[PDB]
Amino acid sequence: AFRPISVFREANEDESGFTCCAFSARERFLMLGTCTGQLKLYNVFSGQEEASYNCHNSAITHLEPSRDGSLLLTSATWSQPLSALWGMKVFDMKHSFTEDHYVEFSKHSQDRVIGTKGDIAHIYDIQTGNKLLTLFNPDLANNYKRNCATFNPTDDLVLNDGVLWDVRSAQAIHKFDKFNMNISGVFHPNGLEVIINTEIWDLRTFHLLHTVPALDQCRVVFNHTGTVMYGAMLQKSPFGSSFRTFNATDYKPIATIDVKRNIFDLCTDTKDCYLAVIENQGSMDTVCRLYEVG
Amino acid sequence: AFRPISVFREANEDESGFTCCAFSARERFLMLGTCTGQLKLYNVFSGQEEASYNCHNSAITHLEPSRDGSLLLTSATWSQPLSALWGMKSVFDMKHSFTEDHYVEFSKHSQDRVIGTKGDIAHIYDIQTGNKLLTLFNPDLANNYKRNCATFNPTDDLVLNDGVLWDVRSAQAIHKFDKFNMNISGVFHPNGLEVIINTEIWDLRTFHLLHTVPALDQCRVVFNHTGTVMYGAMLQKSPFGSSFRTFNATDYKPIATIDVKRNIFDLCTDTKDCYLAVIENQSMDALNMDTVCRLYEV
Numbered sequence: 296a297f298r299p300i301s302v303f304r305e306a307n308e309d310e311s312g313f314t315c316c317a318f319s320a321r322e323r324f325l326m327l328g329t330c331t332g333q334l335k336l337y338n339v340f341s342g343q344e345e346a347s348y349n350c351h352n353s354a355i356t357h358l359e360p361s362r363d364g365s366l367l368l369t370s371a372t373w374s375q376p377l378s379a380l381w382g383m384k385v386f387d388m389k390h391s392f393t394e395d396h397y398v399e400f401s402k403h404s405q406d407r408v409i410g411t412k413g414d415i416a417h418i419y420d421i422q423t424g425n426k427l428l429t430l431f432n433p434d435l436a437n438n439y440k441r442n443c444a445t446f447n448p449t450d451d452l453v454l455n456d457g458v459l460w461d462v463r464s465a466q467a468i469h470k471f472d473k474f475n476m477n478i479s480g481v482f483h484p485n486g487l488e489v490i491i492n493t494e495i496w497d498l499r500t501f502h503l504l505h506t507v508p509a510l511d512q513c514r515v516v517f518n519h520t521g522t523v524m525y526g527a528m529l530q531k532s533p534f535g536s537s538f539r540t541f542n543a544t545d546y547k548p549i550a551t552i553d554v555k556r557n558i559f560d561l562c563t564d565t566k567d568c569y570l571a572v573i574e575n576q577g578s579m580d581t582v583c584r585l586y587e588v589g
Numbered sequence: 590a591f592r593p594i595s596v597f598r599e600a601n602e603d604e605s606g607f608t609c610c611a612f613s614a615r616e617r618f619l620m621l622g623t624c625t626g627q628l629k630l631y632n633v634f635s636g637q638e639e640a641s642y643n644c645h646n647s648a649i650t651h652l653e654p655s656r657d658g659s660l661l662l663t664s665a666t667w668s669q670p671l672s673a674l675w676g677m678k679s680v681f682d683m684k685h686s687f688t689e690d691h692y693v694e695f696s697k698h699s700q701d702r703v704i705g706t707k708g709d710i711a712h713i714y715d716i717q718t719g720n721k722l723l724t725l726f727n728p729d730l731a732n733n734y735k736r737n738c739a740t741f742n743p744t745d746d747l748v749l750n751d752g753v754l755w756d757v758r759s760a761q762a763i764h765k766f767d768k769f770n771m772n773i774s775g776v777f778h779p780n781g782l783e784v785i786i787n788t789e790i791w792d793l794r795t796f797h798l799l800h801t802v803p804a805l806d807q808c809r810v811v812f813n814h815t816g817t818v819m820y821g822a823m824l825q826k827s828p829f830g831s832s833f834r835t836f837n838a839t840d841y842k843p844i845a846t847i848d849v850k851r852n853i854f855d856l857c858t859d860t861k862d863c864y865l866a867v868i869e870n871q872s873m874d875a876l877n878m879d880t881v882c883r884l885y886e887v
């Protein structure tokens with residue numbers, strides 16, 4: 296049950312150019328990246344645009360606010376810096392990650408950033424911005440075209456290019472075998488499973504647990520309690536006109552939602568009451584439609 | 590860093606009698622056994638008691654909730670029965686007893702069986718019927734470990750009992766690991782490839798010695814749920830002293846040595862491995878039993 300509420304659109308523009316969405320830490324703001332590298336803040340209540348910040352010189356591809364509301368990670372498409380860390384408590388650049396096309400925070404304590412440059416993962420200290428670790432084992436590389444390195448929920452492990460790393464020893468534990476060209480995978484928020492495209496792997500024994508065909512070429516996001524998984528399939532619009540929900544315990548579908556328009560991105564708020572979806576109104580005119588979750 | 594978050598005692602008792610603990614399937618709720626045979630449910634953050642159940646007429650030594658929240662194993666000191674299986678669905682009720690076993694745990698992959706230990710002997714039981722399916726003891730291969738604790742491997746194909754590897758389907762001993770200590774019988778690595786018997790790390794394929802880790806000596810070793818950290822409390826009334834040790838599960842390198850300067854009765858982690866609960870007595874080798882639960886954020 297996804298009940299459309301409202302639309303956020305770019306004020307003072309013929310066509311809308313939203314490319315990515317994230318709710319602010321305490322959800323008073325929807326943060327919308329644009330195709331020209333602006334970060335626009337919208338009040339969820341009033342629907343009004345409160346600020347437009349010049350973050351990058353190309354389309355924003357990724358946004359992640361820190362849980363404490365003090366920091367924001369951004370990634371763009373081309374040029375430099377590809378990724379940056381911003382203070383949210385005046386809006387200022389804290390550090391740049393010049394060559395990393397994707398960045399995420401550590402999960403348990405958000406003291407670190409993990410960046411991806413092709414097949415290579417970099418870990419940075421938030422305070423200093425210094426590079427602490429480079430994770431790349433050329434013996435084990437899968438060369439995934441959409442590789443995105445990520446920490447597990449405890450920050451002890453990293454998944455990079457389908458390879459599981461022990462962060463403390465900076466050594467590869469296991470290479471998961473390649474069965475697609477693009478998707479490198481994520482940790483299940485439950486901490487026990489690795490989800491790589493259609494393959495569900497046991498984190499501890501590395502045995503295959505499940506095949507989930509409906510996840511093929513999907514971006515996967517979880518609700519904040521990790522009971523529901525969202526998948527939007529990659530096809531310019533990154534995804535198509537539908538997303539799918541899955542029970543995160545058994546990987547069985549809950550709903551296929553056809554919005555009848557190409558999806559650029561989707562995110563949930565911390566309380567799992569809202570779904571924001573970037574939808575192409577044109578045939579870009581990419582608006583952000585808000586849905587009640589339920 | 591282990592950051593103390595909360596401390597609490599057994600509510601309203603002159604002397605606090607917590608002896609063991611395990612996190613519930615419910616996020617912020619810890620189950621605790623007591624020296625008078627009660628099972629307590631506490632809010633681990635507020636320290637407030639929620640529920641109490643009468644399980645045994647002697648001290649609870651160990652408890653293990655099932656992953657699905659439906660079942661609980663308990664073991665007591667000198668009660669009859671020594672161990673029992675409880676339903677927690679609607680009414681809290683005893684399903685089955687394991688008369689002679691001083692320790693019990695669930696099978697690992699599918700929790701459809703219980704494995705109990707009586708000295709050097711392992712018993713395997715069906716959860717549905719309570720029926721004893723197997724008695725595992727080989728008089729030729731016994732190591733006679735004083736703190737023997739029989740266990741299934743991650744896939745439930747194998748059992749380690751008194752340092753002997755058993756094929757469960759055939760109920761035959763397939764290998765005896767040579768004895769290097771008097772007490773510690775060992776556990777499976779959650780990766781399913783290694784057996785950890787006191788200071789010895791054995792390869793499950795070749796049965797070759799992979800590593801010797803002196804810092805593990807006389808430790809009850811447990812893994813966090815993710816299998817990234819090994820926690821060891823050393824034997825020295827509590828069986829344990831005032832220290833617990835952590836090791837990297839991938840390379841067995843020590844991480845931390847934590848001396849709480851009080852005897853430890855038990856320790857456990859939450860399903861998300863964010864927290865460590867420790868039961869500690871309030872001087873060293875205190876005759877007085879007055880324990881607290883301390884919660885650390887990891």
Ligand SMILES: Fc1cccc(N2CCC[C@@H](Nc3cc(N4CCOCC4)ncn3)C2)c1
Pocket residue numbers: 608609624648649650651666692736737738772773807808809824826827828854855
């Ligand atoms: F050295 C080992 C090796 C393997 C397992 C253990 N454990 C298994 C769980 C139970 C442990 N024993 C106790 C005993 C105990 N007390 C309660 C008070 O009366 C004395 C026994 N309190 C807590 N734990 C021993 C010890």
